[PDB]
Design an enzyme around this catalytic site. Structure first.
Site, mmCIF file in Angstrom:
data_model
loop_
_atom_site.group_PDB
_atom_site.id
_atom_site.type_symbol
_atom_site.label_atom_id
_atom_site.label_comp_id
_atom_site.label_asym_id
_atom_site.label_seq_id
_atom_site.Cartn_x
_atom_site.Cartn_y
_atom_site.Cartn_z
ATOM 1 N N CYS F 15 31.693 7.021 -28.960
ATOM 2 C CA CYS F 15 32.369 6.285 -27.900
ATOM 3 C C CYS F 15 33.882 6.452 -27.938
ATOM 4 O O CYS F 15 34.527 6.398 -26.888
ATOM 5 C CB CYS F 15 32.011 4.805 -27.968
ATOM 6 S SG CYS F 15 32.688 3.825 -26.605
ATOM 7 N N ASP F 16 34.466 6.653 -29.113
ATOM 8 C CA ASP F 16 35.910 6.529 -29.270
ATOM 9 C C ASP F 16 36.406 7.543 -30.295
ATOM 10 O O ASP F 16 37.074 7.204 -31.272
ATOM 11 C CB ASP F 16 36.273 5.106 -29.682
ATOM 12 C CG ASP F 16 35.984 4.103 -28.597
ATOM 13 O OD1 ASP F 16 36.756 4.040 -27.618
ATOM 14 O OD2 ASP F 16 34.973 3.385 -28.719
ATOM 15 N N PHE F 17 36.077 8.806 -30.077
ATOM 16 C CA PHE F 17 36.467 9.896 -30.962
ATOM 17 C C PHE F 17 37.940 10.220 -30.748
ATOM 18 O O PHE F 17 38.292 11.103 -29.971
ATOM 19 C CB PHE F 17 35.565 11.093 -30.698
ATOM 20 C CG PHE F 17 35.809 12.261 -31.586
ATOM 21 C CD1 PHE F 17 35.407 12.232 -32.902
ATOM 22 C CD2 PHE F 17 36.367 13.415 -31.092
ATOM 23 C CE1 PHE F 17 35.602 13.315 -33.720
ATOM 24 C CE2 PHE F 17 36.560 14.501 -31.906
ATOM 25 C CZ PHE F 17 36.176 14.451 -33.221
ATOM 26 N N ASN F 21 40.354 6.879 -35.721
ATOM 27 C CA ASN F 21 39.221 6.920 -36.633
ATOM 28 C C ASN F 21 38.931 8.327 -37.144
ATOM 29 O O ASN F 21 37.797 8.609 -37.539
ATOM 30 C CB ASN F 21 37.990 6.302 -35.982
ATOM 31 C CG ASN F 21 37.688 6.892 -34.642
ATOM 32 O OD1 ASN F 21 37.565 8.102 -34.497
ATOM 33 N ND2 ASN F 21 37.563 6.034 -33.639
#
Lengths: 69, 107, 125, 60, 141, 98
Positions: F15-17, F21
RNA sequence: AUUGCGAUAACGAACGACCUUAACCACUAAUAGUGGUGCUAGCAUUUGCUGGUUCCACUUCUUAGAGGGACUAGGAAGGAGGGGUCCCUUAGACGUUCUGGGCCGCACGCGCGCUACACUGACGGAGCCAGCGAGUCUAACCUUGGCCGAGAGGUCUUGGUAAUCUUGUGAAACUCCGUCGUGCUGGGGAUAGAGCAUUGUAAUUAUUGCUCUUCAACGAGGAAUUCCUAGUAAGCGCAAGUCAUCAGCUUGCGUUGAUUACGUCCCUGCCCUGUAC
């Protein structure tokens, strides 16, 4: 590329023939379709208005509005 | 606003307050959706039609004039003129189209 | 001595006071002609009580106004109110009641705030 | 094409958050043929809607 | 007749400053072009030659409209906000040394005089001078 | 870029590459909040975000703008390209969208 | 709402759940305001217009204190607030006082904030407007005016125990005229060098202020998450508190002043109305 900040003879000739074509002229217009810097445009308008080539309708330092006539 | 109406009186030649009215009426969405997950299509009331038009017009103008050379009055004038026409070049016309075609898909 | 009245107007913390007496139509604010009121963009907000009734009404009277507190915008709204209230008070005493109500009809048609203060007040703690 | 319709009665709030009003609406081109529709914004009697789809009816 | 009150502010001041400069009697401090005029300012006055005359005119008008004034009130009048870097803005007074010499200069050409109850008041010659320039400014219309 | 293609092949979309992170080919990916399957109705919409988010960073800070980019015959991946349902790992963990 | 009609083996009784604001008007008083009068300056000369400084009249504006002015009836308004405090141990004993240091140290984690990423702007000149406070003889508080200095600051006098003096607290945003021209730029000002002052017994690891030089990250911020329905949110500044000096803090005040609902039980949370468990 960079906008011009000193007036070559070629652009001076260009200004005098092109500007009477436009319905509406302002600092933003001369910087856009001609390529002079903003410090030239403020000088050009005062000169062209004095010379009678463009017609003022309002002046406000932070905005200016001239017309074909 | 004072400067904006002047500009519209020179680019084109209409009574400028008429041009404003055209942009408002022409821009407000006429169908929308709501969350039920899934979405369902619904009709929109005349008052909300006016609110949406105003919001879309000024937001489009604001973003066009950030990190600009044109002033606010220049970009707001251009938005209004393009939206009185059917011109898809205006920010607001694009937004209206997406809302309605998505609503069509879900109804 | 001479026919005269005085009236006041309010806005938020501004307080305009006006004297009206018989004379030759002149209108001054703080001793300066009304054409110099500032800021420029709001100046028509003060012409309203003149243009709305017509300049012929003023030829026989002198108005002079002082404005005191408030801020740049709020005190503009004070003076326009003091003029309008002052004008009807002069007619009410020195001409018929018919013309008095003719004035009111014009003012309250355009904007109620020409005669009545808006009564908004800062929210308490 | 578009169709205009006039609001004659407001029936009640609907939807999971109350975000939608149900309304009874009369066609403007010819009276009768009344239909019931869902409206998103604030609405009153005598308001005019632009029904972009006609032969569809609100859930109930 | 005409009074200073009959003329727009930034129109009287421009006219009178231009007149006052031509007469050449107004004595300048000589340290002009170094000084910022305020500890709140950044960069000196942008109009390098004219700015001292402009202020001289402004002070004369401000006194004419009032009962009397002193140097301290002028410093408050021309003060402004200073940025204070990363901390929030604050009001700061203007330079005293400029304003004091302005008043002393105007007094030598006789526009202004020392009042009882302190401070400076307009001279009758000051009235006569300023009223003349007012008339010319309207007449030029 | 190639890492995103692999996950899409195996059946999953992060979802949030993005840079909050990833740690520093020497990179490693440190968490997977709210991952979804390739069958989800919005799979392309989230997919293009990841590609767009990674392009923004290399342009803005690093000035950069078989493989992707210069030296490779295709500039950057696209959702309907190189996605071939290799491994269906989204069935071992029923992430979202059956 | 145990707030009420009715019904009838019941009838009649007991705690919890009035007081001050906003808003109109008679009465006070003046340390507040207006007008006239005497004198007087400038402009112009129908006898006007804008001011300065001795008395007189008034109370409308201001004042502050007092008195009266919605009950569900269109209208100021169909309100806001008031569980805690017999045993043991005793010579320098659960002490006195002086000098210096620390509470400010920082690979890091969590949270409240200040300043920005620019043109709806930065810089220069000009215009020019508030409300709530607080102030010395106990002695040295709030400070006008004159002079010196680029500035910070210094120096000689002065009014006020205060609706009277500082103080019209001439506040900032804001308005007008110019320079800059989309370039981490004249945006932004951290870190750092040199020098000049002020408080204090004492400023080094550096209270605060000023001047020149140095010119960092930051190109609108992922998952998460806070407050808010009108003179309200947000923008802007001022006063008080603590206090020798020292605010980016807390409380209050004014200036400019929007967008979007006038609903629901989807999410979070609270409350009320089968069985011996």
């Amino acid at each position: 590329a960079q906008h011009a900040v000193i007036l070559d003879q070629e652009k001076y000739d260009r200004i005098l023939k092109e500007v009477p074509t436009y319905r509406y002229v302002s600092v933003s217009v001369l910087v856009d379709r001609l390529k002079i810097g903003g410090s030239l445009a403020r000088i050009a308008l005062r000169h062209l208005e004095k010379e009678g080539i463009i017609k003022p309708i309002s002046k406000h330092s932070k905005q200016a509005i001239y017309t074909r006539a | 606003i004072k400067h904006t109406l002047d500009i519209i009186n020179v680019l084109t030649d209409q009574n400028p307050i008429q041009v404003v009215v055209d942009a408002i009426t022409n821009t407000g969405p006429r169908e929308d959706t709501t969350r039920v997950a899934r979405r369902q299509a619904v009709d929109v009331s005349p008052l909300r039609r006016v609110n949406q038009a105003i919001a879309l017009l000024t937001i489009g103008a604001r973003e066009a004039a950030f990190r600009n050379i044109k002033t606010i009055a220049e970009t707001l004038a251009e938005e209004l003129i393009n939206a009185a026409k059917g011109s898809s070049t205006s920010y607001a016309i694009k937004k209206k189209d997406e809302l309605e075609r998505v609503a069509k898909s879900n109804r | 001595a001479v026919p005269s009245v005085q009236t006041f107007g309010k806005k938020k913390s501004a307080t305009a006071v006006a004297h009206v007496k018989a004379g030759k139509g002149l209108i001054k604010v703080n001793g300066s002609p009304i054409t110099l009121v500032e800021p420029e963009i709001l100046r028509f907000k003060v012409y309203e009580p003149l243009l709305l009734v017509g300049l012929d009404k003023f030829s026989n009277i002198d108005i002079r106004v002082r404005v005191t507190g408030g801020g740049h915008v709020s005190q503009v709204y004070a003076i326009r109110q003091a003029i309008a209230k002052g004008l009807v008070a002069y007619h009410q005493k020195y001409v018929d009641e018919q013309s008095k109500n003719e004035l009111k009809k014009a003012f309250t048609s355009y904007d109620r705030t020409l005669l009545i203060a808006d009564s908004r007040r800062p929210e308490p703690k | 094409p578009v169709t205009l319709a006039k609001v004659i009665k407001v029936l009640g709030r609907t939807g999971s958050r109350g975000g939608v009003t149900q309304v009874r609406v009369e066609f403007l081109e010819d009276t009768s043929r009344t239909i019931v529709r869902n409206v998103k914004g604030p609405v009153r009697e005598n308001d005019i809607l632009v029904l972009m789809e006609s032969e569809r009816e609100a859930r109930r | 007749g005409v009074s200073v009150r009959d003329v727009a502010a930034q129109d009287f001041i421009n006219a009178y400053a231009s007149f006052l400069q031509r007469q050449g009697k107004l004595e300048v401090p000589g340290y002009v072009d170094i000084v910022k005029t305020s500890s709140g300012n950044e960069m000196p006055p942008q109009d390098a030659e004219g700015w001292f005359y402009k202020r001289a005119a402004s002070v004369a008008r401000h006194i004419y409209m009032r009962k009397q004034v002193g140097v301290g009130k002028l410093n408050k009048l021309y003060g402004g906000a200073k940025s204070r870097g990363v901390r929030p803005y604050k009001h700061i007074d203007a330079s005293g040394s400029i304003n004091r010499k302005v008043l002393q200069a105007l007094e030598k050409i006789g526009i202004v005089e020392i009042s009882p109850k302190g401070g400076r008041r307009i001279s009758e010659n000051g009235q006569r001078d300023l009223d003349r320039i007012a008339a010319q400014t309207l007449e030029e219309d | 870029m190639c890492f995103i293609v692999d996950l899409a092949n195996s059946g999953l979309i992060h979802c949030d590459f993005n840079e909050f992170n990833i740690m520093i080919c020497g990179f490693v990916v440190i968490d997977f909040p709210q991952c979804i399957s390739i069958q989800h109705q919005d799979a392309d919409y989230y997919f293009q975000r990841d590609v767009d988010c990674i392009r923004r960073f290399f342009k803005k800070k690093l000035k950069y703008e078989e493989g992707f980019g210069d030296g490779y015959k295709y500039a950057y991946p696209d959702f309907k390209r190189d996605v071939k349902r290799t491994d269906n790992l989204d069935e071992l963990v029923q992430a979202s969208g059956f």
